[PDB]
Design an enzyme around this catalytic site. Structure first.
Site, PDB file in Angstrom:
ATOM      1  CD  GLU A   1      43.347  57.783  -4.196  1.00 29.47           C
ATOM      2  OE1 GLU A   1      44.251  57.525  -5.019  1.00 29.47           O
ATOM      3  OE2 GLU A   1      43.531  58.522  -3.213  1.00 29.47           O
TER       4      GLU A   1
ATOM      5  CG  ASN B   1      53.404  56.095  -5.746  1.00 30.47           C
ATOM      6  OD1 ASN B   1      53.074  55.073  -5.147  1.00 30.47           O
ATOM      7  ND2 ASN B   1      52.529  56.970  -6.189  1.00 30.47           N
TER       8      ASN B   1
ATOM      9  CG  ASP C   1      57.971  55.623  -3.010  1.00 33.94           C
ATOM     10  OD1 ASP C   1      57.282  55.292  -3.997  1.00 33.94           O
ATOM     11  OD2 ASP C   1      57.602  55.393  -1.845  1.00 33.94           O
TER      12      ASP C   1
ATOM     13  CB  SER D   1      55.880  52.357  -3.674  1.00 35.94           C
ATOM     14  OG  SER D   1      55.433  53.701  -3.699  1.00 35.94           O
TER      15      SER D   1
ATOM     16  CG  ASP E   1      49.647  54.320  -5.271  1.00 37.77           C
ATOM     17  OD1 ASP E   1      50.188  53.895  -4.233  1.00 37.77           O
ATOM     18  OD2 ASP E   1      49.720  55.502  -5.632  1.00 37.77           O
TER      19      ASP E   1
ATOM     20  CG  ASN F   1      52.275  52.970  -1.752  1.00 43.32           C
ATOM     21  OD1 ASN F   1      53.207  52.784  -0.992  1.00 43.32           O
ATOM     22  ND2 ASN F   1      52.433  53.443  -2.977  1.00 43.32           N
TER      23      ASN F   1
ATOM     24  CG  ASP G   1      48.122  52.819   9.994  1.00 44.86           C
ATOM     25  OD1 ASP G   1      48.416  51.835  10.708  1.00 44.86           O
ATOM     26  OD2 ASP G   1      48.966  53.527   9.392  1.00 44.86           O
TER      27      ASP G   1
END
Ligand code: NA
Ligand code: NA
Length: 129
Positions: free
Chosen positions: A35, A46, A48, A50, A52, A59, A101
């Site tokens: 990562e 990203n 969209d 957003s 990280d 995110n 989650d």
């Protein structure tokens, strides 16, 4: 801060990630490797809008507030910048929420594509833990 492999394994272990929700330490180190390349200051934008953040590339759409991700949740209740600290505590506590989650570590695309089903124990081999 750029962690050494065993150095990070030890920090993660101390923070209770070893076998957290059934994921052995090797999984967490492998994920961090792909990562962020063990760099706490890693950021990536990203498509969209957003971003990280940090060692585990958490995110901003869901988990932290960076003040520039419209309509995002801040489910870990922290500024995203806190995830870039040389102290991995915030990143680790937030990762625990993420992995609980429902999708487990599949939430990390690099883990799913590059660690899952591999010999992840290799990532902590040689380390004194
Ligand atoms: Na957010
Ligand atoms: Na799971």
């Amino acid at each position: 801060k750029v962690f050494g492999r065993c150095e990070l394994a030890a920090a993660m272990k101390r923070h209770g990630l070893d076998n957290y929700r059934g994921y052995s330490l090797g999984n967490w180190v492998c994920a961090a490797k792909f990562e962020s390349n063990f760099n706490t200051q890693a950021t990536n934008r990203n498509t969209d809008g957003s971003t990280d953040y940090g060692i585990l590339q958490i995110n901003s759409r869901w988990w932290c507030n960076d003040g520039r991700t419209p309509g995002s949740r801040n489910l870990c209740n922290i500024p995203c910048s806190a995830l870039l600290s040389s102290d991995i505590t915030a990143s680790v506590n937030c990762a625990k929420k993420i992995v609980s989650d429902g999708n487990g570590m599949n939430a990390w695309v690099a883990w799913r594509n590059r660690c899952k089903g591999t010999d992840v124990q290799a990532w902590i081999r040689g380390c004194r833990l």
